[PDB]
Amino acid sequence: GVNEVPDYHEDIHTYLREMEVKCKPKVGYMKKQPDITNSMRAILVDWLVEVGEEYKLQNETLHLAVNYIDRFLSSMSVLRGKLQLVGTAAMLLASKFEEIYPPEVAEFVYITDDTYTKKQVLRMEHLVLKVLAFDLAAPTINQFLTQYFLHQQPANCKVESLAMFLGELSLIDADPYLKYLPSVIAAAAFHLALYTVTGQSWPESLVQKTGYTLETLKPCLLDLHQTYLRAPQHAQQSIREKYKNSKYHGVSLLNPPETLNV
Amino acid sequence: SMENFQKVEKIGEGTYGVVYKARNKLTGEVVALKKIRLDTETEGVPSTAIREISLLKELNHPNIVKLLDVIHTENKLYLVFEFLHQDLKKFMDASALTGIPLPLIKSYLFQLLQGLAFCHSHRVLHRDLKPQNLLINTEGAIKLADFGLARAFGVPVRTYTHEVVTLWYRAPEILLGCKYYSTAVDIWSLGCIFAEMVTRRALFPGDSEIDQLFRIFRTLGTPDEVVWPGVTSMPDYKPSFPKWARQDFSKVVPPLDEDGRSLLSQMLHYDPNKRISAKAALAHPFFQDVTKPVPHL
Ligand SMILES: O=C1CC(I)=CC=N1
Ligand SMILES: O=C1CC(I)=CC=N1
Ligand SMILES: O=C1CC(I)=CC=N1
Ligand SMILES: O=C1CC(I)=CC=N1
């Protein structure tokens, strides 16, 4: 019923797609950053996952924060010593945007081990706000997933949890996932996840919704499978640790498929 | 920064400090300035403003107040808004004795629904629709304003902040303390506002939540599973609620025609799922003849 906003689902989808284009980071930003690297970024996002888990924040908050970080680094040269300052400030902004009960600024200062002063966090907040020109309402992988999980006639906790997980793994790795739009990554996560559990594919209903076939979703699905396969060996583990818990039904502990079929 | 704005008068005071009417010295544009003090050593930019600014940035429609600029300093944020003559509440009270022409009521409700249809078609809930937050000009327009309690939602919706609408305009789903709420709550509020434009008194002026609840039942009939499935397994529902009957909208809103009464009931339906959508309501027979009259000021 009204919680799936039937009279509006279409219009919202159209709009989110149009918006995920404008809020897209620069694909090749990491090359034009002299002093920071995909590796350092990986550490940062992994740290936000922890922070998200420690403060029991929403997954959506985490996604937004990463969106804020990539777009800032798409405009602003940052030194390595201040990369965390940007991330703390972004998480702060996303919390304020998205959470009912955001952590107080003091707790965002606590998690940086007093690397930074409160004044620095608060000043970086304003600067982030100016650099994004307050365009904070970014469509996320989750905003697409939640809608895709709807066309999933057989509602599967395991499938829903698993897609979230693949979803989050993509946050960590600027290469390759900066070159895919959220809507795409959500589908690839959603396809990959359904198959692994039920045995099924991207449904036609979602083909008609998105205009996305498995042909057009293959490049991404390839990188994702790879990411899933290498997952236990990735230098960044917070997400796997996260999705062991009962809450997410231990989907991380599940063994990925070995072939996809195309 | 603000050197080109000349303050005229104070025009309001809400979430963030005071709102002032001001005049662009160079262009002659009249504006409303909202001054938001930034907690530079404590909490920073308030979540309210992050939400209002970001959401109003996206929302560009003739029936949503235009945010024209945001002027930053180290220590303050000024939001530059278009100036509109006054809010519906002030217009209502000014019209307490003369009444509001039916054609203007219809025009106003039509525009309100157009504005609101836009907000919902853009993953945004207003959640503070009340006459004081709706602005009119002199040429016959009305606009949604004050988007501070607004929230960009996902699909499906999740649990959002429970302390949302002003009591009088609060939907039963929020009162009863349901886990999920959606676009229907904003329709409920407009429905309250339709009634109020017609009678110039608030429809459900409750002193408390329990009183608000009783006020609605008495008018629309204590709901049951046949009208509102799940109403009895709602968190704050009580089997004990007296069973009042629905009052004829011919005594509720005597001045309202057969089409009006129909659309109202639809807007005030108990069940959120069966409650009309802003989009639906835009098609309703009531608006078939809608014009754009000017208000007497
Ligand atoms: O305190 C910290 C910061 C970061 I970035 C990663 C891990 N611990
Ligand atoms: O500095 C200011 C503040 C205001 I309110 C209006 C004009 N100039
Ligand atoms: O300078 C501005 C104006 C506006 I409208 C939004 C954000 N920044
Ligand atoms: O934009 C606005 C705000 C206010 I308070 C009054 C009139 N116009």
Segments making up each domain of chain B, as ranges: 2-85, 86-296
Same fold, A11-24+138-262 and A25-137: yes
Q: Nearest Cβ partner of A105 from B44, B55, B273?
A: B44
Q: Where are the alpha helices (DSSP H) in chain A?
A: 9-22, 38-54, 59-73, 80-98, 105-110, 118-131, 141-151, 157-172, 174-177, 182-197, 204-210, 218-229, 238-242
Tell which phi-psi region holds residue A248, choosing left (phi > 0), alpha (psi between -120 and 50) or beta: alpha
Please provide residue A118's backbone torsions phi and psi, each rounded to the nearest 5 degrees: -65, -40
Is 3.40.190.10 the CATH number for A25-137?
no
Candidates A67, A126, A134, partner chain B, best to mutate (most B CBs within 10 A): A134
From CA A256, how far away is CA A15, in angstroms rounded? 33
DSSP helix/strand/coil, B212: helix
Contact residues on chain A for B46, CB-CB shorter than 8 A: 96
CATH superfamily for B86-296 is Transferase(Phosphotransferase) domain 1 (1.10.510.10)
- Under CATH, what is the fold of the domain B2-85? Phosphorylase Kinase; domain 1 (3.30.200)
Which homologous superfamily does the CATH classification assign to the domain defined by A11-24+138-262?
Cyclin-like (1.10.472.10)
Q: CA-to-CA distance for B3 and B64, rounded, in angstroms?
A: 27
> N- to C-terminal Cα distance for chain B?
34
H/E segment holding residue B194: helix B184-199
CA B10 to chain centroid:
23
What does the block give as tokens for A219? 């490049």
Candidates A84, A253, A258, A261; CA nearest to A158 is: A253
Of the candidates B182, B108, B179, the residue with the CA atom closest to the CA atom of residue B152:
B182
Of the residues B128, B186, B248, B257, only one is catalytic, namely B128
Instruction: Give dist(CA B143, CA A26) in Å, integer.
Output: 37
Domain spans, chain A: 11-24+138-262, 25-137
Task: Output phi, psi for B86, to 5 deg.
Answer: -170, 175
User: Which bin fits A199, alpha (ψ -120 to 50), beta or left (φ > 0)?
Assistant: left
Number of CB atoms found within 10 A of residue B280's CB: 16
| Residues A220/A189, Cβ–Cβ less than 8 Å | no
- Resolution as reported, in Å: 2.6
Q: How far apart are the first and last CA of chain A?
A: 36
Which residues line the pocket of ligand 3, CB cutoff 6 A?
A: A 133-134; B 53, 57, 67, 69-70
The answer to whether residue B128 is catalytic is yes
Taking the C-alpha atoms of residue A175 and residue A120, their distance in angstroms, rounded to an integer, is 30
Q: Cα separations (Å) of A63 from A23, A78, A94, A169, B136?
A: 13, 21, 9, 11, 39
What is the rounded CA–CA span in Å between residue B182 and residue B174?
Answer: 10
Alpha-carbon distance values, B49 to A129, A197, B44 (Å): 11, 43, 11
Nearest CA to B137 out of B199, B66, B70, B35 is that of: B66
